[PDB]
Amino acid sequence: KKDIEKLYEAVPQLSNVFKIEDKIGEGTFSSVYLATAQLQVGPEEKIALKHLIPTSHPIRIAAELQCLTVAGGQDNVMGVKYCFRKNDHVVIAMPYLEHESFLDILNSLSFQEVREYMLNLFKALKRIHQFGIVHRDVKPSNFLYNRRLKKYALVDFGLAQGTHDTKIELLKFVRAGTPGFRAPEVLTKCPNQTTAIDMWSAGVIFLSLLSGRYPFYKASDDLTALAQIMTIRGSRETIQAAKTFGKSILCSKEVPAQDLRKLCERLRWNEVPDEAYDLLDKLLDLNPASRITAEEALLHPFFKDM
Amino acid sequence: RLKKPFVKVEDMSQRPFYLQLTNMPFINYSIQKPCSPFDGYCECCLQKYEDLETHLLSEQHRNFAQSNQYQVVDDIVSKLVFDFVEYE
Ligand SMILES: O=c1[nH]c([C@@H]2CCCN2)nc2c1oc1ccc(Cl)cc12
Ligand SMILES: [Zn+2]
């Protein structure tokens, strides 16, 4: 309420255009608000307004906008309608999509709905990865899901980096995500981090969906998450994989790799196919070179026929 | 020499970092669904701040905030189509 007032004051032009109703999201680097506006084309429309923290470097602001303009608005990737600026305050106006809380729907989705969710996530990931965008903060709060409408939008390019050959110019001139969704090569600070790190994240999401638990890896720092990952995927397996990316991991307590089906079943629909756990295993590959890509994921037997 | 349990991470070509907890993570199946089985700095002024509001109000920030450094942002904005109705 006081936040709404301060936003209007920071970007005065907003009061000419929007009736700002409520704050619908908040992260380290932004707050997202629900607002109403009148379209010239006729309809009134619900709008999401994303106020970026005024400490963002202009290049960071610009790179996020460029992701939205170039890659967004298609294939379950959020696009941008307009952008408002007064000085250091930038507000991105995007279409509003009404959406579920992940906690709410988690234990109430049918299995077919689990597979539709994952299929549609991989469509969004394939799209951004085609442009050489590494999202770096893929998690349920950044993947909008309208259960009723079966609509999906991947959001928030505010932590993105480019691949070596990225098609988003500003990304070459480039902030840490949630520990629980970060890949082993991320947690261990590998200098080379590719699109594979987002595929790991999608596997953590899939792990929550199959086990009925969220947040799966509940960790406030990177090494705690790594320790939790080792109890799932195995310490020896993690130590071996980390070598392939130039990291030496020592662990005092050896813990075995878990069977994924048994893990998810004990944590948690009557005949989940082997293909689901096989796909999970590929998503949670400890080696980022061998980890499945979004394009490969879409062709996985788990998704015949959709 | 490190008290157990620990995790240690080093780059294979050289500064180590560590984890030490009372207990290592343990997969808890008995905890009920949906609980986990395991249950600033300014980029503009290139400086860490004490308080956000007061840092924004500082002449260092105000100066950046009002410069031409957001040209790169306005350049993309100019390419977008304004399709809302605007009131006076
Ligand atoms: O970039 C976003 N981040 C977020 C969240 C909140 C701040 C951290 N990520 N939400 C949205 C974002 O864009 C949106 C567009 C429409 C709707 Cl309904 C929500 C969002
Ligand atoms: Zn500053």
Coordinates of C-alpha atoms and ligand atoms in Angstrom, one line a residue:
Chain A
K1 CA 0.0 0.0 0.0
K2 CA 2.8 2.4 0.9
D3 CA 4.8 0.5 -1.8
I4 CA 2.2 1.4 -4.4
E5 CA 2.3 5.1 -3.3
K6 CA 6.1 5.2 -3.5
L7 CA 6.0 3.6 -7.0
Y8 CA 3.6 6.2 -8.4
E9 CA 5.9 8.9 -6.9
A10 CA 9.0 7.4 -8.4
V11 CA 7.5 7.1 -11.9
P12 CA 4.8 9.8 -12.1
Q13 CA 3.8 8.9 -15.7
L14 CA 2.4 5.6 -14.2
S15 CA -0.6 7.5 -12.7
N16 CA -1.7 8.6 -16.2
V17 CA -1.9 5.0 -17.3
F18 CA -2.4 2.5 -14.5
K19 CA -4.7 1.7 -11.6
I20 CA -2.2 -0.2 -9.5
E21 CA -4.2 -2.7 -7.3
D22 CA -1.8 -5.0 -5.4
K23 CA 1.8 -6.3 -5.2
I24 CA 1.8 -9.9 -6.6
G25 CA 5.5 -10.8 -6.4
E26 CA 8.8 -9.7 -4.9
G27 CA 12.4 -10.9 -5.2
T28 CA 15.9 -9.5 -4.5
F29 CA 16.0 -7.3 -7.6
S30 CA 12.3 -6.4 -8.3
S31 CA 8.7 -6.1 -7.2
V32 CA 5.8 -7.1 -9.5
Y33 CA 2.4 -5.3 -9.2
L34 CA -1.1 -6.1 -10.5
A35 CA -2.6 -3.1 -12.3
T36 CA -5.5 -2.2 -14.6
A37 CA -5.1 -0.2 -17.8
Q38 CA -7.3 0.8 -20.8
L39 CA -6.1 -0.4 -24.2
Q40 CA -6.4 2.0 -27.2
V41 CA -7.8 -1.0 -29.1
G42 CA -10.8 -0.9 -26.7
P43 CA -10.5 -3.5 -23.9
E44 CA -9.5 -2.8 -20.3
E45 CA -6.6 -5.2 -19.4
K46 CA -4.8 -6.5 -16.4
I47 CA -1.1 -5.7 -16.4
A48 CA 1.9 -6.8 -14.4
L49 CA 4.2 -4.0 -13.6
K50 CA 7.8 -4.9 -12.7
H51 CA 9.7 -2.3 -10.8
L52 CA 13.4 -3.0 -11.0
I53 CA 15.5 -2.1 -8.0
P54 CA 17.0 1.3 -8.8
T55 CA 20.5 0.0 -8.0
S56 CA 20.5 -2.1 -11.3
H57 CA 23.1 -1.2 -13.8
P58 CA 21.5 0.3 -16.9
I59 CA 23.1 -2.5 -19.0
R60 CA 21.5 -5.1 -16.7
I61 CA 18.1 -3.3 -17.1
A62 CA 18.7 -3.1 -20.9
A63 CA 19.7 -6.8 -21.2
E64 CA 16.5 -7.9 -19.4
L65 CA 14.4 -5.8 -21.7
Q66 CA 16.3 -7.1 -24.7
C67 CA 15.6 -10.8 -23.7
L68 CA 11.9 -9.9 -23.4
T69 CA 11.8 -8.1 -26.8
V70 CA 13.9 -10.5 -28.8
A71 CA 13.1 -13.9 -27.2
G72 CA 9.9 -13.2 -25.3
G73 CA 6.2 -13.2 -26.3
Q74 CA 6.4 -16.7 -27.8
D75 CA 6.7 -20.3 -26.8
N76 CA 5.7 -19.8 -23.1
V77 CA 8.3 -17.1 -22.7
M78 CA 6.9 -13.8 -21.3
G79 CA 7.1 -10.7 -23.6
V80 CA 6.9 -7.0 -22.9
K81 CA 4.2 -4.4 -23.8
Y82 CA 6.1 -1.3 -22.7
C83 CA 8.6 0.2 -20.3
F84 CA 8.5 3.3 -18.2
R85 CA 11.5 5.2 -16.9
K86 CA 12.1 8.2 -14.6
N87 CA 15.8 8.4 -13.9
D88 CA 17.0 5.2 -12.0
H89 CA 13.4 3.8 -11.7
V90 CA 12.4 1.5 -14.5
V91 CA 9.1 -0.2 -14.7
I92 CA 8.4 -3.0 -17.2
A93 CA 4.8 -3.5 -18.3
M94 CA 3.9 -7.0 -19.2
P95 CA 0.6 -9.0 -19.8
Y96 CA -0.9 -10.3 -16.5
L97 CA -1.4 -14.1 -16.4
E98 CA -3.5 -15.3 -13.5
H99 CA -1.6 -18.2 -12.0
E100 CA -1.4 -20.8 -9.3
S101 CA 0.9 -21.0 -6.3
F102 CA 3.1 -24.0 -6.7
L103 CA 2.6 -25.1 -3.1
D104 CA -1.2 -25.1 -3.6
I105 CA -1.4 -27.2 -6.8
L106 CA 1.6 -29.4 -6.1
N107 CA -0.1 -32.3 -4.4
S108 CA -3.3 -32.0 -6.4
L109 CA -2.1 -32.2 -10.0
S110 CA -3.0 -35.3 -12.0
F111 CA -0.1 -37.1 -13.6
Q112 CA -1.1 -35.9 -17.1
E113 CA -0.9 -32.3 -15.8
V114 CA 2.6 -33.0 -14.5
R115 CA 3.6 -34.0 -18.0
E116 CA 1.9 -31.0 -19.6
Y117 CA 3.7 -28.7 -17.2
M118 CA 7.1 -30.2 -17.9
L119 CA 6.5 -30.3 -21.7
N120 CA 5.5 -26.6 -21.6
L121 CA 8.5 -25.7 -19.4
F122 CA 10.9 -27.3 -22.0
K123 CA 9.3 -25.4 -24.8
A124 CA 10.2 -22.1 -23.0
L125 CA 13.7 -23.3 -22.2
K126 CA 14.3 -24.4 -25.8
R127 CA 13.2 -20.9 -27.0
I128 CA 15.5 -19.0 -24.7
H129 CA 18.4 -21.4 -25.2
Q130 CA 18.1 -20.9 -29.0
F131 CA 19.0 -17.3 -28.4
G132 CA 21.9 -18.2 -26.1
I133 CA 20.2 -17.0 -23.0
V134 CA 21.2 -18.7 -19.7
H135 CA 18.2 -17.8 -17.4
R136 CA 20.1 -18.7 -14.1
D137 CA 16.9 -18.5 -11.9
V138 CA 14.5 -21.2 -13.2
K139 CA 12.2 -22.2 -10.4
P140 CA 8.4 -22.4 -9.9
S141 CA 7.9 -18.8 -8.8
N142 CA 9.5 -17.8 -12.2
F143 CA 7.3 -20.1 -14.3
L144 CA 3.6 -18.9 -14.3
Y145 CA 1.1 -21.7 -14.6
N146 CA -2.6 -21.1 -15.2
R147 CA -4.1 -24.5 -14.4
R148 CA -7.6 -23.7 -15.7
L149 CA -6.5 -22.2 -19.0
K150 CA -3.4 -24.4 -19.4
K151 CA -1.3 -21.3 -20.0
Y152 CA 2.4 -21.0 -19.2
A153 CA 5.0 -18.1 -19.0
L154 CA 8.6 -18.2 -18.1
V155 CA 9.5 -14.9 -16.5
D156 CA 12.4 -12.8 -15.1
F157 CA 15.5 -12.3 -17.2
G158 CA 17.0 -10.1 -14.5
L159 CA 19.8 -12.6 -13.6
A160 CA 20.4 -13.9 -17.2
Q161 CA 23.8 -14.3 -18.7
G162 CA 24.8 -15.1 -22.3
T163 CA 26.4 -18.1 -23.8
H164 CA 29.8 -17.4 -25.6
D165 CA 27.8 -17.0 -28.9
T166 CA 24.7 -15.4 -27.5
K167 CA 22.2 -13.6 -29.8
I168 CA 21.3 -11.1 -27.2
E169 CA 24.0 -8.5 -27.7
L170 CA 23.7 -6.8 -24.3
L171 CA 24.2 -10.1 -22.4
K172 CA 27.9 -10.1 -23.5
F173 CA 28.3 -7.0 -21.2
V174 CA 27.1 -8.8 -18.1
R175 CA 23.6 -11.9 -9.5
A176 CA 22.9 -15.3 -7.8
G177 CA 19.7 -17.4 -8.1
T178 CA 18.1 -19.6 -5.4
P179 CA 20.6 -22.1 -3.9
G180 CA 18.0 -25.0 -4.0
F181 CA 17.7 -24.7 -7.9
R182 CA 21.4 -24.3 -8.7
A183 CA 23.4 -26.9 -10.6
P184 CA 26.5 -28.6 -9.0
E185 CA 28.8 -26.6 -11.4
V186 CA 27.1 -23.4 -10.2
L187 CA 27.3 -24.3 -6.5
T188 CA 31.0 -25.1 -6.9
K189 CA 31.6 -21.8 -8.9
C190 CA 32.7 -23.4 -12.2
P191 CA 33.8 -20.4 -14.4
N192 CA 32.1 -22.1 -17.4
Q193 CA 28.3 -22.2 -16.9
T194 CA 26.1 -23.0 -19.9
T195 CA 22.4 -23.5 -20.7
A196 CA 22.8 -26.9 -19.0
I197 CA 22.4 -25.1 -15.6
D198 CA 18.7 -24.3 -16.5
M199 CA 18.1 -27.9 -17.4
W200 CA 19.3 -28.9 -13.9
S201 CA 16.8 -26.4 -12.4
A202 CA 14.0 -27.9 -14.5
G203 CA 15.0 -31.3 -13.1
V204 CA 14.7 -29.9 -9.5
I205 CA 11.2 -28.7 -10.4
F206 CA 10.4 -32.2 -11.9
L207 CA 11.8 -33.7 -8.6
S208 CA 9.3 -31.6 -6.6
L209 CA 6.4 -32.7 -8.9
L210 CA 7.3 -36.4 -8.6
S211 CA 7.9 -36.4 -4.8
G212 CA 5.2 -34.0 -3.8
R213 CA 7.7 -31.9 -1.8
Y214 CA 8.5 -28.2 -2.2
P215 CA 11.0 -26.7 -1.7
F216 CA 12.9 -30.0 -2.3
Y217 CA 16.3 -28.7 -1.5
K218 CA 15.7 -26.3 1.3
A219 CA 19.0 -24.4 1.6
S220 CA 20.0 -20.9 2.3
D221 CA 23.5 -21.3 0.9
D222 CA 25.3 -23.0 -2.0
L223 CA 27.2 -25.6 -0.1
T224 CA 24.2 -26.8 2.0
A225 CA 22.4 -27.3 -1.3
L226 CA 25.4 -29.3 -2.7
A227 CA 25.4 -31.5 0.5
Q228 CA 21.7 -32.1 0.0
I229 CA 22.3 -32.9 -3.7
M230 CA 24.9 -35.5 -2.7
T231 CA 22.5 -37.3 -0.5
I232 CA 20.2 -37.7 -3.5
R233 CA 22.6 -38.3 -6.4
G234 CA 25.4 -39.7 -4.3
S235 CA 28.7 -38.2 -2.9
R236 CA 31.0 -40.4 -5.0
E237 CA 29.0 -39.7 -8.1
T238 CA 29.1 -36.0 -7.4
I239 CA 32.9 -36.0 -6.6
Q240 CA 33.6 -37.9 -9.9
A241 CA 31.4 -35.5 -12.0
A242 CA 33.0 -32.4 -10.4
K243 CA 36.5 -33.5 -11.5
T244 CA 35.3 -33.3 -15.1
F245 CA 34.7 -29.6 -14.6
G246 CA 37.9 -28.9 -12.6
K247 CA 36.6 -29.0 -9.0
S248 CA 37.9 -31.2 -6.3
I249 CA 35.2 -32.1 -3.7
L250 CA 36.1 -33.8 -0.4
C251 CA 33.3 -35.2 1.8
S252 CA 33.8 -36.7 5.2
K253 CA 30.6 -38.8 5.0
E254 CA 30.0 -41.1 2.0
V255 CA 26.3 -41.4 1.0
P256 CA 24.9 -43.6 -1.7
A257 CA 23.0 -42.5 -4.8
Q258 CA 19.3 -42.9 -4.3
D259 CA 17.0 -44.8 -6.7
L260 CA 14.7 -42.0 -8.1
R261 CA 11.5 -44.0 -8.3
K262 CA 11.8 -45.4 -4.8
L263 CA 12.8 -41.9 -3.4
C264 CA 9.8 -40.2 -5.1
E265 CA 7.3 -42.9 -4.2
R266 CA 8.3 -43.0 -0.5
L267 CA 8.2 -39.2 -0.4
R268 CA 4.7 -39.1 -2.1
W269 CA -0.2 -41.6 -10.0
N270 CA -0.6 -45.4 -9.6
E271 CA 1.5 -46.2 -12.6
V272 CA 4.1 -43.5 -13.1
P273 CA 6.1 -44.8 -16.1
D274 CA 9.9 -45.6 -15.9
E275 CA 10.3 -42.9 -18.6
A276 CA 9.4 -40.2 -16.1
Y277 CA 12.3 -41.3 -13.7
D278 CA 14.6 -41.8 -16.7
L279 CA 14.0 -38.2 -17.8
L280 CA 14.6 -37.0 -14.2
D281 CA 17.9 -38.9 -14.1
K282 CA 19.0 -37.1 -17.4
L283 CA 17.9 -33.7 -16.1
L284 CA 19.8 -34.3 -12.8
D285 CA 22.9 -35.5 -14.6
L286 CA 25.8 -34.3 -12.4
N287 CA 27.9 -33.8 -15.5
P288 CA 26.8 -30.7 -17.4
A289 CA 28.3 -31.9 -20.7
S290 CA 26.2 -35.0 -20.8
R291 CA 23.0 -33.4 -19.2
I292 CA 20.0 -33.5 -21.5
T293 CA 19.1 -30.3 -23.5
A294 CA 15.6 -28.7 -23.7
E295 CA 15.4 -29.8 -27.4
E296 CA 16.4 -33.4 -26.5
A297 CA 14.0 -33.3 -23.5
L298 CA 11.0 -32.5 -25.9
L299 CA 11.9 -35.7 -27.9
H300 CA 12.2 -37.9 -24.8
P301 CA 9.9 -41.0 -24.7
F302 CA 8.2 -39.6 -21.6
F303 CA 6.3 -37.2 -23.9
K304 CA 4.9 -39.5 -26.5
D305 CA 2.4 -38.6 -27.8
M306 CA 1.8 -34.9 -27.1
Chain B
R1 CA 42.1 -31.5 11.2
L2 CA 38.6 -30.4 10.1
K3 CA 35.9 -31.3 12.6
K4 CA 33.4 -33.8 11.0
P5 CA 31.1 -33.7 9.2
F6 CA 32.4 -31.4 6.5
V7 CA 32.4 -30.8 2.8
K8 CA 35.4 -29.1 1.1
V9 CA 35.5 -27.6 -2.4
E10 CA 38.7 -26.4 -4.2
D11 CA 39.5 -25.5 -7.8
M12 CA 41.8 -28.1 -9.3
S13 CA 44.1 -25.2 -10.4
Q14 CA 44.5 -22.6 -7.6
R15 CA 40.9 -20.7 -2.5
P16 CA 39.0 -23.5 -0.8
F17 CA 35.5 -23.1 0.6
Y18 CA 33.9 -25.3 3.3
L19 CA 30.7 -26.6 4.7
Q20 CA 30.6 -27.7 8.4
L21 CA 27.2 -28.5 10.0
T22 CA 26.3 -30.3 13.2
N23 CA 24.5 -32.9 11.0
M24 CA 24.8 -33.5 7.3
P25 CA 21.5 -33.5 5.4
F26 CA 19.4 -36.6 6.0
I27 CA 16.4 -37.6 3.8
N28 CA 13.4 -37.5 6.1
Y29 CA 10.5 -39.5 4.7
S30 CA 8.4 -39.2 7.9
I31 CA 7.9 -35.5 7.6
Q32 CA 4.5 -34.8 6.0
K33 CA 3.9 -33.6 2.4
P34 CA 4.8 -31.1 1.1
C35 CA 7.7 -30.3 3.5
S36 CA 11.2 -30.7 2.2
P37 CA 12.7 -34.1 3.1
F38 CA 15.5 -31.8 4.5
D39 CA 13.3 -29.9 6.9
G40 CA 23.2 -4.4 -0.4
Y41 CA 25.4 -3.4 -3.3
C42 CA 24.8 -0.7 -6.0
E43 CA 25.9 -1.7 -9.5
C44 CA 25.6 1.9 -10.6
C45 CA 27.9 3.6 -8.0
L46 CA 30.0 0.4 -7.8
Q47 CA 29.7 0.5 -4.0
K48 CA 28.1 -1.4 -1.2
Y49 CA 25.5 0.7 0.8
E50 CA 24.3 0.8 4.4
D51 CA 20.7 1.7 3.8
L52 CA 18.9 1.6 0.4
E53 CA 16.7 4.7 0.7
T54 CA 19.6 6.8 2.0
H55 CA 21.9 5.5 -0.8
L56 CA 19.4 6.4 -3.4
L57 CA 19.2 9.9 -1.9
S58 CA 23.0 10.4 -1.9
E59 CA 24.6 12.7 -4.4
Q60 CA 26.7 9.9 -5.8
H61 CA 23.5 8.0 -6.8
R62 CA 21.4 11.0 -7.7
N63 CA 24.2 12.0 -10.2
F64 CA 24.2 8.6 -11.9
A65 CA 20.3 8.5 -11.7
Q66 CA 20.1 11.7 -13.7
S67 CA 22.9 11.1 -16.2
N68 CA 22.8 9.8 -19.8
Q69 CA 23.8 6.3 -18.6
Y70 CA 20.3 5.0 -19.3
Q71 CA 20.6 5.7 -23.0
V72 CA 21.0 2.0 -23.6
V73 CA 17.6 1.5 -21.9
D74 CA 15.8 4.3 -23.7
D75 CA 17.1 2.9 -27.0
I76 CA 15.2 -0.3 -26.6
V77 CA 12.1 1.4 -25.2
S78 CA 11.9 3.7 -28.3
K79 CA 11.5 0.5 -30.3
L80 CA 8.4 -0.7 -28.3
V81 CA 4.8 0.3 -29.2
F82 CA 2.8 2.2 -26.7
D83 CA -0.8 0.8 -26.8
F84 CA -2.4 2.0 -23.6
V85 CA -4.7 5.0 -23.2
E86 CA -3.0 7.9 -21.4
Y87 CA -4.9 10.5 -19.3
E88 CA -3.7 14.1 -18.5
Ligands
LIG1 O1 9.9 -10.9 -14.3 C1 9.0 -11.3 -13.5 N1 9.4 -11.7 -12.2 C2 8.4 -12.2 -11.3 C3 8.8 -12.7 -10.1 C4 8.5 -11.6 -9.0 C5 9.9 -10.9 -8.8 C6 10.9 -12.1 -9.0 N2 10.3 -12.9 -10.1 N3 7.1 -12.2 -11.7 C7 6.7 -11.8 -13.0 C8 7.7 -11.3 -13.8 O2 7.1 -11.0 -14.9 C9 5.8 -11.2 -14.8 C10 4.8 -11.0 -15.7 C11 3.5 -11.3 -15.4 C12 3.2 -11.8 -14.1 CL1 1.6 -12.2 -13.7 C13 4.3 -12.0 -13.2 C14 5.6 -11.7 -13.6
ZN2 ZN 24.1 4.0 -6.4

